[PDB]
Design a protein around this ligand. Sequence first.
Ligand code: MG
Ligand code: MG
Ligand code: MG
Ligand code: MG
Ligand code: MG
Ligand code: ZN
Lengths: 117, 197, 127, 97, 217, 63
Amino acid sequence: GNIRNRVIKRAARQIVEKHFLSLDKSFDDNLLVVQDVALVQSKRVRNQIAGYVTHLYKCILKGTAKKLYIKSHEDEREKKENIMPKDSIMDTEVVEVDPMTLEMLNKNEYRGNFKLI
Amino acid sequence: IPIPEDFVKLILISQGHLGGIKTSKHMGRYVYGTRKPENIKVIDIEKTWEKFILASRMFCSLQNPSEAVVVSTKTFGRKGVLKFCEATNATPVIGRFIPGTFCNNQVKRPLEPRVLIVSDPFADKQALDESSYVNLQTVAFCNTDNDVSFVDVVIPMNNRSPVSISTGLFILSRLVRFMKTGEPLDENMKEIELFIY
Amino acid sequence: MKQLSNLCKAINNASRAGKRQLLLHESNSVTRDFLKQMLKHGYITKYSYVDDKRKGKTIVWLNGRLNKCGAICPNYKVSLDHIENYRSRLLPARQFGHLLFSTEKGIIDHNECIGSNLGGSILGFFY
Amino acid sequence: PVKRKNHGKNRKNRGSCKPVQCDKCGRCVPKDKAIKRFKIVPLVEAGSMDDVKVASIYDIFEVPRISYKNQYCISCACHARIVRVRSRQGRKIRYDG
Amino acid sequence: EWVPKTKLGKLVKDRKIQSLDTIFTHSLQIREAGIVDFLLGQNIRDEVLAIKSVQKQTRAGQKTSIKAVVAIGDGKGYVGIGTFSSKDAATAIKTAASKAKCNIRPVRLGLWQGEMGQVHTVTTRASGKCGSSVVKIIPAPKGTGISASSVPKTILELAGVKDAYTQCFGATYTTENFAKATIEALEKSSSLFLPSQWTEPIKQLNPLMEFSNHLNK
Amino acid sequence: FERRICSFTKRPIASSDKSSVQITLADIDENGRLLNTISTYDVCGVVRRNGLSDGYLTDKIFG
RNA sequence: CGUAAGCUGGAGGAGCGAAGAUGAUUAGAUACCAUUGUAGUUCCAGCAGUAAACUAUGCCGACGAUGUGAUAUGAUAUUAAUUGUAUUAGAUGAUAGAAAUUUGAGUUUUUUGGCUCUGGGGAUAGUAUGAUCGCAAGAUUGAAAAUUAAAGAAAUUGACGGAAGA
Ligand SMILES: [Mg+2]
Ligand SMILES: [Mg+2]
Ligand SMILES: [Mg+2]
Ligand SMILES: [Mg+2]
Ligand SMILES: [Mg+2]
Ligand SMILES: [Zn+2]
């Protein structure tokens, strides 16, 4: 009761994959959709499935749900992180070079502008 | 032969030439000297460019680049390999490497690659361990203190700092683009921000 | 023959691991005629040896063609009619292999021992 | 078979050692093959720490401690649960101080 | 029927690889029994060597299993041996025959003396040891035939050697280790480096790299 | 019955060698381009396990 | 030459203590527990020659993978290190082995560098008899008649503990 069965959890994880888009934030509308897409013998086990679906879907939107990949949610999240910084690390003109590392740059005859500590 | 231009500013910033306190017996010629106060070895940036040419030479002339796998276990390493994989059409494998993906045929995602690439050899042992069972070529970025079993090309870098690991993927992304399509390398230096956080 | 067996054991350890060269700290007139017979049939490359008013040194360069070399002690007096018996014992096949006999003409193969009808003391084998 | 690498004790390149005696039973044991513990206890209890303060003629003073060293044979030691049976693969761990 | 789950087996179904010789020289390990069946049909010869029952004790009773060994063989120079244990004696032999097809190997043949003539005999002397049993194979002149015991003669008839001399050393009453030692004895003779192999062979490309564009598309 | 010979230790390579790999390199001209030619080398199984396989390859190509 | 006992002669004897004698436990205790108590263990001069006297691994000689230590000492170097020779402790690989394990117990059926000693299924038996030693106790050498299909080494699965933890 207080701990869900592995048959319940496995059958709940599949419905997130194929039917992600018809989910919502509220619990009571998830009771309707499982009557369309799932064939369940009993009534009491059915309410545990739809209550577990809002647990996973809400923990997708803000939390860290491991071992579950949905293509739709991850794409727009990377678009928030595809912004570019205005200033990179490569804007600095002065490089800090050690007196040991100075001799390599002179041996290979490189054209960088090196300044020590 | 191609010439490295203004990539010395990338490695000297990102501390890619920094090493460990002690060196292994097989690393050898890649050390130019040590610091006096902190006793930290240095890596010659000349010969590391030689391995960058050679690793690209083995990666090219594959008829289909989808038959090339990259592995990574470091938490920072996920962002950098996914930027590298899309430009080179390679299949990336992130996280804990499941034992049996090359040999056992009952795993969920079976895969039959030809060329294997490894970020850190000590951190990813099972991929090199399963590369001894089926005949594969391996590329690895190794520090001064690592074992070199079951690896034929070594690119010596610094693999502790997460900022440095995205650089070696960044230089590798240009050369395969350069060897396949005749283009000027180092088009936009500002594209390193998509690799780092 | 302490020096001859000490030579052969160092080669089998070296040729199995795959090393290129070898340095030993003793030289001897028996060992020098051994290697010239090994050099003639083409099993190894060139070699050299240094005199330093001491036991002497020996330096040899391999090419990776040796299966096993060996030495026999004690040195048996073999007649002419028993070379056909010893050759079946210590050799894998009839088509190849070699033997070294310390005949009075010199250290020669068993093919020259039969061809000149001379039997003597036996030294060792290599193939 | 052999059970431990060093057979009973940690003695090498020697021939003999003079024996010492256990405190509980009193049998002779060699000084290498012994179990020795060290502990330091104070003269006063912590439960009687505050009550000496109201009876002190002095202003401030330090409470002193004493040390002890004990020796046992291994029959007495395992019976008093000083040293316990460990796993076979876990026998090779050595807890230096 | 057979379906090529492994990518290497898909090439042999599409008639890309003609014979076994490109497989053994390029050292591609096989991981399906269907590859040797499609390459070689109705020339497979097989048998069993021994069948033994092992019995393990538990609290109430004693669970009993059956172990069997199967030798697979061609006519000329392909021998493999695998083992399996099962609860049923019928399915014990059937799976063990498939594992023997995965362990197949070739053997070198030669002559007794000379250079010309049909190959009949193992070339050089070799010795195989697996768990206190040593088997020794000595080459023979022509017209002698195979002179050996009950079990390892039946293996050598599968390999195709007409004539050889054998000896034994050690405990041979366990037929499992006695069969595994002749495998190492046949392998050790073929692995000797000969002066006739001093000539340089031609470099080639792996056949997986050549037909890579056909496989994916 | 043919056998592949390793180019590094100059010995034949067995059939059941599980670590023998044929290393494939494309030939690249001056200034860097692509050419549709492949040059190969072969290695043995024992030389890779020790870690000697890297130092042979650098001296094979660059010298 | 040879721990520990054990013998003859002289010196000494604080604690410990075989043998002997008492108090409890027990069906029975001449045993474990406790109280007494002699020889001995201490020194000098001599005999005696046995131990799980064990690293259960005879002695000499050539070659060997990395890492952390220990004892002695030399060179470079200078207040900061990395290096030579001889022993020695431990960990990870590699070989060899029936396996536990393992820088030798490796370089072996593709068996050879030199030299001494020991074993041949269990039991009878280290027992009889003869010879040589010793004040004695005893020590070294060392069989057979009649018997018997097993005795034994390393390791897996159970069952049991008047065994231990969570
Ligand atoms: Mg002692
Ligand atoms: Mg005496
Ligand atoms: Mg004795
Ligand atoms: Mg003894
Ligand atoms: Mg001794
Ligand atoms: Zn005690």
